[PDB]
């Protein structure tokens, strides 16, 4: 699998959210690029759409491709999902989420100029620009 | 099963209108027919976190008219994460009953409570719905119907979690004119407006009550405590949310004043002599919604 | 049962014939539920020392068995004499359950109860048996015996009231290998030791729970309190007694974890996932374990 | 400048921790390589030798090259510091560093199987690999 | 001659602009050259009835550097005042004071007799001291306190400080005012009402970022949590903090300032920055709080 | 004097010389009063940790100095960050003392003081140099040197912070041989004694007082909090660590019995008739290098 077309830091943010150097897998990447982009390689590993989806909010308009069959297997580019579960923290200081062993998750839906995101615990509604900011 | 069998009670949102009336009906039906035995050998923890001697007492008299076994605890002003509490309580007792300063709690308990199901007794801020169940199963009571009802909501709209709550109930039924009376600091919220917008559902905001007061059916008072604004703003403005005897002259004979409880200033007390005065009886129904929402909850078959 | 009407104080007031007692009946009144075996009783649950935790097991047991339960809760502070107290008190009901901030003060209710049975849950320091027979009964039905087994205790071994009275009863059966993981500061008491020692129970010490994790099946954690030592000896040398569970790769299939409760840094919580995790359960069968304590010495006969 | 043979899963930690990936310059990075090791290249900057010297702890055994002047300029091999700096947390929770706008600072010093690290401001010294743990 | 002598300063509506001028002249002298002993054989009492740290110490050591003796108390969180201030204006020269009931400073000064009081805030009312001090530290920083744009951010509703800012230099010409602050924390009417009888010109403003450019003094106010709730607060806490990466379009002359504490409203890389002020504002408060105790004590200031 | 203008924060920051320094301006300042030599100065009294015996002490040497003082003692509760503060406060005064319950403290102050020293009067576990200095300045002064001395120090050396001070201070002298009277579980740690070891300096462990009582010029009694142990394990082994009268007849004519203070159980008070009483002349010596350490940071020339 490759990702192509990724913003400027956005490829570290990636590396460090979606943990994709916890493998053993051989991994390359670029940062500030020709285009000023960045690019991820990674051998032999298939990501799902969700996880595609998953980078949306981070890369929106971005490619995602195969090359572990040394050919050009799929194309994908990433589509906004409905769930956002493992990276986000809640803007939210009371939310229970925080001190407890449970993954956050927020559920999205799309607005004019902004991407509301609803917590599953505190039912809290947000702008994507808040929840990113911390 | 029922539809709500074995389901946890954790926000408003979560119950469908198909739901609702399951509920209020219940509760009709345990008022007129008491049942006194149906939860025998069961047992329920009573865990408030956040201490709440009025809604614990009227949630574990529930509990025992009903035949049920009480363990539990009121905390003051916890190391142990909730998951693991809840990961131990769950292995003790039947149903949870959890009242918590934190939102979102009842909602991670229920993923750390197996089988054992998880009633909301207020999450902080987010939700309250046992409060809005009381809440209905009174104004159906007395209006007959929750449809084509004129609904005035005066207080503290913009931090009151239990008007909205029940705004967002009473949408879920049709017809319903809505009068929002509150200073302009604590004005019913956006996400509210909208979402009676979204439904075609008229709505208007109001200085006092005095020009609502001829055509409405329910009169809502909430508590508007005084910390939300300085003192000062507080005295010039409350005079405009209050509610005097003297203010019922005009009212409709079918109208109910309600109130969550407890009033300090908002509800003078010569008011409870009127017949328009529910506020008793609406916490007093409270057992009935709280019976019916663990009853529920605990047998599928129900001989209603 | 030969406990008909005594008091549980002390572990070492158990006979190992009693234990089995106890645990049989854990056993069978959780098989087959009597929700109405001790119906029309009245127990008191004297929580001198308050522990929310402890008391709802306790309170739970008995409405399980169909009894009334009264008590209270004390806040933390430290007039009526304990004496006076249990003497008002035995008069009121059938059974007094007690946890007290004073060491000896569930002694001192037995001589002013009369015939009114006077349950231990824990005076400070010295015993606490509910704990034990709980835990005892949970390593009994997960390796089916008490027997040549072999059992780890991690953690604070030197003020631990629950592992000293774990291995005091523990030492009544037979092949039992121990090994004691903790640092040097809160190691095992030379008086365990010496009571391992009069029995040929064999016994070692370890620094880490590397060394043995491969061949034990029972693995008890207990909860350093970080104010044993001043934070800084505590973080340095804390990290060779939590448990994450990448440790679990040659443990035993049949091994399990235990532990008190509440669990702080000792435990990662990706051991819940795992199917070694058995401190929930563990404390789930404090219930079965109190229910047939009850029973036993309110009723004679195993109805 | 050019890093070879960074042991595995730490180069993904050498840029996390010391914030490599906050330039405009090109960067590539490869992790799970023939040697497993790992790469890291920056175009156009330079490291001093402090700052060779702060991945000691963490990449012992590893090469720095140089191919800003398209040759191999000079070979290095990074000796361990007298203190390392912003980095390292302290384990004692009750540290004034930790609520503070510090920076966290420890003293290095060499023992036969241990690394003690003192902290500038408790004055507490620790395993580094209790420090490292945290 | 000196129209302060032995007058009590109570409010900011209470000093004229010839007033203001006076305190804000003998600050800046007994900064320029001390007056170690000019309160030499006099106490003063520092009274306060609602504890502030931060302003205790400020006030008494602006007492210490006249050389005045200080006797003083601060009660905990929870007698008639007049008869406090009935006996206390026996004892003492003058009174400092901070009371949490609105309007307390001026009713100790009817019945104080000749004992000037002075306040140090009465909760939600008055608190003139912190914006002497805000004056003076404007006037140093900027040379002058007229023809500035000054921006006001944070809780712009409820902030004392701001309030009585805004009415002190609406007393001084070609002010322009940009209020930065969320709706439901915006500048009272009333305070706008009064720079509109004054024609001054004033602008709302939904970030910093927006008037960065433009702006001379930039003043951050703590936006307390518990006047939104969490979430709320978390929406909107975004457009009214400040990182140094925002301070590229500011002027050379402008500075910062902040009546402290900051919690999250001033990120820590703004202390570095040469527009940074909010301490050296802090610095400032000995002088303002020195000039306003020796105006009051002495007829002839020969300065 | 080379410590002008620097900060007193730990005692391994002192050098021998300059120990010399502080020693000898104490006894300067003792023999010949120096009332107004920090007169004009304000010190601020900074007791973020709450310590009544320390804070008496402090104050009362800046005022022997005439100087004047402003400060606080903070209540038991656990905002504005320390570094806020200090840089607040260090607009305010000269000289801050400041006694801190998290480690390092002090030495953040430093980083945020500028050029206004800053004195530790106790950061927790760590450090607290005045102490040292004044059992320092005790013991030469009873004893007449500091070097070839017969000190025995007991109690609890695991958690002392005053005999690690006290230890390492005394071992940048020469021929001094210790012995340490401690039960295991409070044992003197290892880094003392490696750091005697790599020195060369004698030192001995010892169960009982009685063993040493003969050869001792120092005997240094401490503090054993029965929290560190449960009160049972106190209770048996506190009475080798305990002094009464009896215990001082073979004890040397020149030997001075020394306390940080407050005695609980450790010394009966039959010790205050004998003349080996030197625990509260040491508290009274307290003033006296405090009065120097003050004096060498805020003046260069001995007046
Ligand atoms: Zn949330
Ligand atoms: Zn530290």
Redo the contacts between chains.
Sequence with gaps: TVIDHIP??I??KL??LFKL?????????????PS?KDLIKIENTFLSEDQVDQLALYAPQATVNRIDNYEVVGKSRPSLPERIDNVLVC???????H????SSSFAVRKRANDIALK?????????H??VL?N | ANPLYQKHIISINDLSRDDLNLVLATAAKLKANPQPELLKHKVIASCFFEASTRTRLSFETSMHRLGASVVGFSDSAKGETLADTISVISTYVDAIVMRHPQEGAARLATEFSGNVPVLNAADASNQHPTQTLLDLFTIQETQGRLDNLHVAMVGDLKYGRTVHSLTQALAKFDGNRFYFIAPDALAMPQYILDMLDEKGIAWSLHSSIEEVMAEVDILYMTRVQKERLDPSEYANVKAQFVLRASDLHNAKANMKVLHPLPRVDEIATDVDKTPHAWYFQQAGNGIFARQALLALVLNRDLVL
């Design positions: 400027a830091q490829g570290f590396l460090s150097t916890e493998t053993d897998q051989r991994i390359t990447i670029g940062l500030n690029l000023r803007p939210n200081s009371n939310c229970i989420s001190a407890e062993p449970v917590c599953k615990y505190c039912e809290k509604e947000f702008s620009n808040v900011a």
